[PDB]
Structures are given as structure tokens and as C-alpha cells.
Structure 1
Amino acid sequence: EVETFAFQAEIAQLMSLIINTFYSNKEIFLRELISNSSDALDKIRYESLTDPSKLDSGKELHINLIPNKQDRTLTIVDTGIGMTKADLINNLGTIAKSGTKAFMEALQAGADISMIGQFGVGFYSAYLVAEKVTVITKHNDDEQYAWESSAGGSFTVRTDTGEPMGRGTKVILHLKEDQTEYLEERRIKEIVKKHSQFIGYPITLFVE
């Protein structure tokens, strides 16, 4: 059923830093998620060159941004390579530890939170706007998994008995009460135009 894991100490520390530090420029989270989606789309596109059977789970390579004012969620959907259970746990992860240490060191040296992506830990910027993050993922070599964290030093991983998604990753941002601007059409459009204008995949902003 539901497995509960402790984040590595440095990741828990980074997450607390992101939740507690005063930082108004919260919009940067979106560029980080779109960039990770783009990297996962590049990964499946690269593997499909030698083995074309990897596109059987889905041909379309895109990113959908889905605001839901009722549920107070902003969903980032991609049809990238997706993640295995091993990737959900082992990845972010030991690889994150190095980047986390270097980013926190840089912050003491006068650096800004907007430079988080340069340390491979850009995803954690989601906690600038979200009280909880749910990640639904599907990789060709594994089943559909659900990862979840409200930070607090832990995360959960469970098999997803929900609706199948073929292949890719869905990031569901359960927004904080005072961060509902990231559900507005004009606001999302402005951020995408400013930070994600040169992404090599269609980005569709859904409307309600």
C-alpha cells in the first residue's frame, strides 16, 4: 500500500529553507517544472531513435498546464520518459545531495533562490507556491506510481490505482491559500512568455 520515506537531511533542510525564507519572486517555480518536463521529453525522444517501440505508450510530445480553481491546483502534465519506482526514490535522492549542498553554500555567498535550477534541484521551488505536491508518473519499464509530499521531512510512494496516463509525469501543485494568482490565465501566460518562451515542445495552457 502506502510507503513513507524520510528525505535525506540536506533535502529536508533545502525544503525548509524554501518554505520559510522571505522571497517574493515565487513565479520561478513554473520555469523549473517546465524545464524538467522538457528534459524528460528530450530523454524519450532520444531513446525513440534507436528503439521506436518506446513511443507505443504515446506519440505526442507536449506539456499541458491545467489550472483548477475549485481544487486550488495547478497541474503540469508532460508525456516525457516518466519515472520508475526506483527513480521516484533513488533519484532526489543521492544526485540531489551534491546540488543541495552547493546551492545552500551559494545562498550564503550572496546568491538568489532564482538560481536553484543551476544546481539540479529546481523542482523544490514548487514549495514556494505549493503546500503539497502530488506527482503521478508512468515509465515504459514500470507501473504507474504516485509520489506525494507536504514537505515536513517525509514523502510517500504508492502504486497508482487511478486513471492510466500511458507515459509521462503529472505534477499536481496543491497551492497555498495566498498563491491563487498561479490559477489565473493572464498570470500563467505572462510567466510562460517571460521564462519558458524557447522550450522545444508545445505548451498548452488549459482554460476553465
Structure 2
Amino acid sequence: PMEEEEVETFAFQAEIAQLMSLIINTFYSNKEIFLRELISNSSDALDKIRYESLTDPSKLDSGKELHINLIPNKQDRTLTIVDTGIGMTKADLINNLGTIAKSGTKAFMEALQAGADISMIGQFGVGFYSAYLVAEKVTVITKHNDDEQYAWESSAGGSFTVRTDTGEPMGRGTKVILHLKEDQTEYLEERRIKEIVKKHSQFIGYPITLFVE
């Protein structure tokens, strides 16, 4: 073909693959907590960049504003969570989002069997995967300070890919893009989103902005 793109395909760590099918194939009632989990991740990443700037203000040259944006797109049926946090290196993506085992995974699977609410997911070190409560597919674009912009992607099925991102440059941070299931479109509604952020994400030490089309 005219153009070529390098893709790297990785198997999810076995327990995490198993946690993902559990999340996807079980019925759960309290799905809205996915949003709280992604906002926390953005909040953590922003704490991190903030921490690093204390000793090295140069680290904020890639953008000084520390914040989180929420972007529903009804045309594409996507909900995007953007932060100007620390972002992830390629290796961060690979190690931290699927490939390296987590201490709490087995235990969280155990708790789910007993009938735990999925809301507890974030106590175990696997909160990200709550996204698959409402998304058939998740794309993570990320730009860390001394590395290139990358795109992580997976629709489950036990696998994810990482590639150099060919999209619009970010400066610094992470964009999580949720391709929503057809029965989960309420999470594109301005009212629903506002309700959910007020109920679950009111201890975020950063400004959050909802962009409404």
C-alpha cells in the first residue's frame, strides 16, 4: 500500500483478560462508576505532573494548565476524557495497561463472585477496566514529556495494540476515548454526565469542563 504503520499486538496478562470477560459478560447495575474511575486516573496523573514540576518547572513547558475535559460526541457515539496529566511513555502503556500482573486482580475477581458491587473495582488496582462496563472499545492516546504520542487500543478478546499515534498532537497528557455500547448512550447526555460527576467525582483537585455540542 502507499502508507505503512507499525503495530504492536500484546496479550493481556491472563488474570486481567479474565477480569475483562467477567466485566463484559456479567450483568452489573451500577455501571455509572466507570466515569468516576477515569476521572480519578486523570486526577492521579495531574498530581503526578504537579509533583514533578515542584523540583522541575521545565516539565510544565508542554502546557501549564492542569485540568480535565469531558467530550461527548453523539455522532461518533464516543465519550472522551482528556487530562493534561503526566501522560504515559510507550513502556508505561504496555506495562501498566494490560501486560503486568496486578496484586489485587485475583482478589477482586473473588469479591465479584461473592457478589461485590463493581464500584469497589478501584480499591484493587484495576479501575481502568470499569470502562468496559459501557464501552465496546477503548482507545487511549497519550503523550509523555520526553517521548512520542502513542495510541493504545482494545475491544477485549484478550488483546490490545500499541502504535505511534498519527492523530492531532496533544502537548502533554492522556485522552481516553470510549466507543460506547448502543444501550449506554445516556452517558453522552449532558444532564446524565453532570449528575454523575456531582454524585461521584466531587473531590477532584482540578477544574473539570464538560464540552457540550
Same fold flag (TM > 0.5): yes
Cα shift at 1:2: 1.0
Task: Give the total of aligned pairs.
Answer: 208
Cα 1:204/1:96, change in 2 over 3 Å: farther
Q: Distance in 2 between matches of 1:16 and 1:91?
A: 19
Give the secondary-structure state (helix, strand or coil) at the position aligned to 2:178. Answer: strand
Cα shift at 1:198: 1.4
* Native 8 Å contact 2:102 2:126 kept in 1: no
**1:146-192 Cα distance to aligned partner (Å, 9 max, x none):** 00000110000000121110000000000001110000000000000
* Native 8 Å contact 1:96 1:120 kept in 2: no
* Native 8 Å contact 2:11 2:99 kept in 1: no
Cα 1:155/1:93, change in 2 over 3 Å: closer
* Native 8 Å contact 1:26 1:128 kept in 2: yes
Give the secondary-structure state (helix, strand or coil) at the position aligned to 1:49. Answer: helix
Question: Could you tell me which residue of structure 2 aligns to residue 192 of structure 1?
Answer: 197
* Native 8 Å contact 2:13 2:101 kept in 1: no
* Native 8 Å contact 1:68 1:74 kept in 2: yes
* Native 8 Å contact 1:96 1:121 kept in 2: no
- Is there any run of 5+ residues in structure 1 with no aligned partner, and where? none
Question: Could you tell me which residue of structure 2 aligns to residue 34 of structure 1?
Answer: 39
- Is there any run of 5+ residues in structure 2 with no aligned partner, and where? 1-5
Cα shift at 1:92: 3.1
TM-score normalised by structure 1 residue count: 0.97
Identity of aligned residues (%): 100
Question: Does 102-111 or 41-50 show the bigger shift?
Answer: 102-111
Cα 1:176/1:94, change in 2 over 3 Å: closer
TM-score normalised by structure 2 residue count: 0.95
Q: Distance in 2 between matches of 1:95 and 1:122?
A: 15
Alpha-carbon RMSD: 1.1
